């Protein structure tokens, strides 16, 4: 159910990446704005190509996200539980959160039921491992930075609107 970096042909990070102070009180949802995927083989393609984009176009040290969730319902390991992401391009947020990126574009298209159910298991695993505070807030990247067009994903965020930890 977790696809490790090695399984998606991850490039090793360019330089050292800072550790997060754990546990985090904030988990942030984002779209990848890539094409989506419904099988591990295609999700792997999506994630590996996003890593290149993030490193080579965005000049990040690594894929921008802690975890990525594919339409197949698998969790793709990005920077993982312990390393600071680069999802908000803002050190205040990035140093105090984990990011879950949803593989696809979700302005009008909804995530799959698999994507939503594994998010529950992923959040629970994080709480159990001491990575996420029991009283965490789960929120949309777009709520935090309304002006950022690439964070918009109305159909994704609407899917979490009734969850108890959602803000």
């Amino acid at each position: 159910d977790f696809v490790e970096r090695q399984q998606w042909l991850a490039q090793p990070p360019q330089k050292e990446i800072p550790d997060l102070e754990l546990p985090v009180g904030l988990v942030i949802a984002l779209p990848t704005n890539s094409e989506n995927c419904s099988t591990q083989a295609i999700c792997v393609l999506r994630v590996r190509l996003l890593q290149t984009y993030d490193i080579e176009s965005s000049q990040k040290c690594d894929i921008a996200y802690n975890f990525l969730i594919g339409g197949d319902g698998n969790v793709y390991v990005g920077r993982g539980w312990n390393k600071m992401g680069a999802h908000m391009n803002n050190i205040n947020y990035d140093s105090q959160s984990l990011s879950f990126a949803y593989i696809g574009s979700f302005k009008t298209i909804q995530p799959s039921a698999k994507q939503l159910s594994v998010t529950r298991l992923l959040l629970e695993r994080g709480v159990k491992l001491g990575k996420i505070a029991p009283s965490y807030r789960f929120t949309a990247s777009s709520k935090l930075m309304p002006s950022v067009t690439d964070f918009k994903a109305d159909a994704l965020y609407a899917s979490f609107a009734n969850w108890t930890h959602w803000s």
Partner: protein, 166 residues
Amino acid sequence: MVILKVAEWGGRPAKRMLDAQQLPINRVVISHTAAEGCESREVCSARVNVVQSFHMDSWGWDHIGYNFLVGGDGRVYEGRGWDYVGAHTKGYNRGSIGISFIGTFTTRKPNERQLEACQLLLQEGVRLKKLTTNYRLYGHRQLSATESPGEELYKIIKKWPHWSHE
């Protein structure tokens, strides 16, 4: 020199019959895998299996795309071999041999054993008449829009006698 056949590193056969090359070949294209390197038969075999899956399952190609790969253990991992057209350099697969260094060589050099393996592989190709005596060698980036084979690896092969900018 060790060349491990597809079966010997635990890989799959081609999905269908591949196109054969006219021998001898006088173009070689050096790439890297842009994933993690490896220092042992076990780890390098693992890396090459993942590469094969990426090429056959994620891209949907008929086999691993390289003719050969070179591991940080100093072993050569057979892909399509000398006699078949690869899927490594678009527009240049026919009439070339694609060799990939296992790893990412953007800011780190390939290791002593990896470089030695590649030199021996090329000399073996000339000796067997798979390659011309005056074959031209290129970095992937000269033929395709890419970082491959990585700046540090590219700087090394640019000083090899067969290197060409034509």
